[PDB]
Amino acid sequence: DNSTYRNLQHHEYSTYTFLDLNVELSKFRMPQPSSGRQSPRH
Template identity: 65%
Template structure:
């Protein structure tokens, strides 16, 4: 029991310790890390949608997938009694 409490306290300490971000660490001379000195990133371009599969959908896409996956479905359970609708 005592060992479990010690391991629990250790896990809490590890989880609650502040994390150091490697990109925010500076050297003693005040220079930033090489990652921050790299070339500037390209501006974000959101005019082109990157998920090309999004445009392959048709009105029948759901039905096509439903029919294709029907063979993996489990059979409908039966109570053994005749249905009141029949």
């Protein structure tokens, strides 16, 4: 079957869909590196 469009998942996307997934991925992230200072102006 090659006559149907399978990308219909994007028809139900709220305004926070992109950020909601980003919250879910925060558990799988590796620890971030540190530059040794809190900010360039510290």
